[PDB]
Curated annotation (Swiss-Prot):
Glycans are attached at N57, N73. This protein is produced by a bicistronic gene which also produces the alternative prion protein/AltPrP (AC F7VJQ1) from an overlapping reading frame. The alternative prion protein/AltPrP (AC F7VJQ1) and PRNP have no apparent direct functional relation since a mutation that removes the start codon of the AltPrP has no apparent effect on the biology of PRNP. In mouse and hamster, the alternative initiation AUG codon is absent and is replaced by a GUG codon. The glycosylation pattern (the amount of mono-, di- and non-glycosylated forms or glycoforms) seems to differ in normal and CJD prion. Monomer and homodimer. Has a tendency to aggregate into amyloid fibrils containing a cross-beta spine, formed by a steric zipper of superposed beta-strands. Soluble oligomers may represent an intermediate stage on the path to fibril formation. Copper binding may promote oligomerization. Interacts with GRB2, APP, ERI3/PRNPIP and SYN1. Mislocalized cytosolically exposed PrP interacts with MGRN1; this interaction alters MGRN1 subcellular location and causes lysosomal enlargement. Interacts with KIAA1191. Interacts with ADGRG6. Its primary physiological function is unclear. May play a role in neuronal development and synaptic plasticity. May be required for neuronal myelin sheath maintenance. May promote myelin homeostasis through acting as an agonist for ADGRG6 receptor. May play a role in iron uptake and iron homeostasis. Soluble oligomers are toxic to cultured neuroblastoma cells and induce apoptosis (in vitro). Association with GPC1 (via its heparan sulfate chains) targets PRNP to lipid rafts. Also provides Cu(2+) or Zn(2+) for the ascorbate-mediated GPC1 deaminase degradation of its heparan sulfate side chains. This is Major prion protein.
Amino acid sequence: LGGYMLGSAMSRPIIHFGSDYEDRYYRENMHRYPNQVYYRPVDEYSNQNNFVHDCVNITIKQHTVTTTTKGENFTETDVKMMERVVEQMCITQYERESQAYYQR
């Protein structure tokens, strides 16, 4: 991700999966999960979901490297959760920047 910036922080969101079980699951380990994501500005790339799938898999694959580097191993269940959280972050960043860039 050598050329990626880092957008703003936010408080932990709540991802309401469809079950209290998964809501708890996220809650247990959300402090190990990321708080921010990596992407580029709306300068050239400039898509919505096709940027989200990139920023997410950038921010998720970087975690699935550093976990293994530390000899930890967040499972594919943890990945599936963080996919959502990182999507919510990345969409929140896109929309905030949109209303400072597109709303120009």
